Amino acid sequence: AHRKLQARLDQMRKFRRQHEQLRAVIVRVLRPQVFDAADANAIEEVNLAYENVKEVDGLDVSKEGTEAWEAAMKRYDERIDRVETRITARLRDQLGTAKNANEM
Amino acid sequence: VYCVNVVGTQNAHNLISISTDGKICSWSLDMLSHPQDSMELVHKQSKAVAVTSMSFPVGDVNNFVVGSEEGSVYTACRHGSKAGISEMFEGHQGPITGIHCH
């Protein structure tokens, strides 16, 4: 009976693990060396996706809040996949700016 | 190899080739001497799928979709934590001969 809640707690802890290990160092990554609109757009997409998961209760072990959590993480997955394809376009722009090793 | 295609931008791009057994390989055009990123598309306790057909979405370099000899449409993402086969479609009672995104 307790094994259903423990897996959902594992899901929320691993969710906060991947979200914090993105979040706390993606500010350092999108810091300009001393500003764009796309960087603060990607940060606020991470914040909006975090609210798009965190309005859904993590404590609903029953099926409806479980699939509401599924819709929340699917919306999260699509949103940071959209941000990830934008930075993947910036990765193609990384050899789009460069040819030699030092600037890479 | 029934399918081979190219995406990426003008300033950086990749050659994408899927074979009958389901092995994908990334290639350069300047160098074909070794594949770059190469792995195997599997699903269903890792059975080797039998990929026939190929479609890219327009504007997508990471996600894509295959058809198969097994009556099965699979979308699949290129890289990341869900590098490999995403999922599965059903409905066809024949081997799939051609797919195309809008």
UniProtKB/Swiss-Prot annotation, chain A:
Medical condition linked: Charcot-Marie-Tooth disease, axonal, type 2O: An axonal form of Charcot-Marie-Tooth disease, a disorder of the peripheral nervous system, characterized by progressive weakness and atrophy, initially of the peroneal muscles and later of the distal muscles of the arms. Charcot-Marie-Tooth disease is classified in two main groups on the basis of electrophysiologic properties and histopathology: primary peripheral demyelinating neuropathies (designated CMT1 when they are dominantly inherited) and primary peripheral axonal neuropathies (CMT2).
Top-level taxonomy: Eukaryota, Metazoa, Chordata, Craniata, Vertebrata
Function: Cytoplasmic dynein 1 acts as a motor for the intracellular retrograde motility of vesicles and organelles along microtubules. Dynein has ATPase activity; the force-producing power stroke is thought to occur on release of ADP. Plays a role in mitotic spindle assembly and metaphase plate congression.
Oligomer and partners: Homodimer. The cytoplasmic dynein 1 complex consists of two catalytic heavy chains (HCs) and a number of non-catalytic subunits presented by intermediate chains (ICs), light intermediate chains (LICs) and light chains (LCs); the composition seems to vary in respect to the IC, LIC and LC composition. The heavy chain homodimer serves as a scaffold for the probable homodimeric assembly of the respective non-catalytic subunits. The ICs and LICs bind directly to the HC dimer and dynein LCs assemble on the IC dimer. Interacts with DYNC1LI1; DYNC1LI1 and DYNC1LI2 bind mutually exclusive to DYNC1H1.
Species name: Homo sapiens (Human)
Covered residues, full protein: 455 to 581 of 4646
Positions in coiled-coil regions: 1-24, 66-89
Entry remark concerning the domains of this protein: Dynein heavy chains probably consist of an N-terminal stem (which binds cargo and interacts with other dynein components), and the head or motor domain. The motor contains six tandemly-linked AAA domains in the head, which form a ring. A stalk-like structure (formed by two of the coiled coil domains) protrudes between AAA 4 and AAA 5 and terminates in a microtubule-binding site. A seventh domain may also contribute to this ring; it is not clear whether the N-terminus or the C-terminus forms this extra domain.
Compartments in which it is found: Cytoplasm, Cytoskeleton
Similarity comment text for this entry: Belongs to the dynein heavy chain family.
Name of the protein this chain belongs to: Cytoplasmic dynein 1 heavy chain 1
Curated annotation (Swiss-Prot), chain B:
Shown part of the complete sequence: 384 to 485 of 638
Subcellular location, record wording: Cytoplasm, Cytoskeleton; Cytoplasm
Record family assignment: Belongs to the dynein intermediate chain family.
Segments annotated as WD repeats: 1-37, 46-86
Domain of life: Eukaryota
Protein name: Cytoplasmic dynein 1 intermediate chain 2
Quaternary structure annotation from Swiss-Prot or TrEMBL: Homodimer. The cytoplasmic dynein 1 complex consists of two catalytic heavy chains (HCs) and a number of non-catalytic subunits presented by intermediate chains (ICs), light intermediate chains (LICs) and light chains (LCs); the composition seems to vary in respect to the IC, LIC and LC composition. The heavy chain homodimer serves as a scaffold for the probable homodimeric assembly of the respective non-catalytic subunits. The ICs and LICs bind directly to the HC dimer and the LCs assemble on the IC dimer. Interacts with DYNLT3. Interacts with DYNLT1.
Post-translational modifications: Pyrophosphorylation by 5-diphosphoinositol pentakisphosphate (5-IP7) promotes interaction with DCTN1. Serine pyrophosphorylation is achieved by Mg(2+)-dependent, but enzyme independent transfer of a beta-phosphate from a inositol pyrophosphate to a pre-phosphorylated serine residue.
Entry function: Acts as one of several non-catalytic accessory components of the cytoplasmic dynein 1 complex that are thought to be involved in linking dynein to cargos and to adapter proteins that regulate dynein function. Cytoplasmic dynein 1 acts as a motor for the intracellular retrograde motility of vesicles and organelles along microtubules. The intermediate chains mediate the binding of dynein to dynactin via its 150 kDa component (p150-glued) DCTN1. Involved in membrane-transport, such as Golgi apparatus, late endosomes and lysosomes.
Clinical note on disease: Neurodevelopmental disorder with microcephaly and structural brain anomalies: An autosomal recessive neurodevelopmental disorder characterized by global developmental delay, severe intellectual disability, microcephaly, dysmorphic facial features, and cerebral malformations including simplification of cerebral gyration, agenesis of the corpus callosum, and brainstem and white matter hypoplasia.
The species this protein was found in: Homo sapiens
UniProt lineage: Eukaryota, Metazoa, Chordata, Craniata, Vertebrata
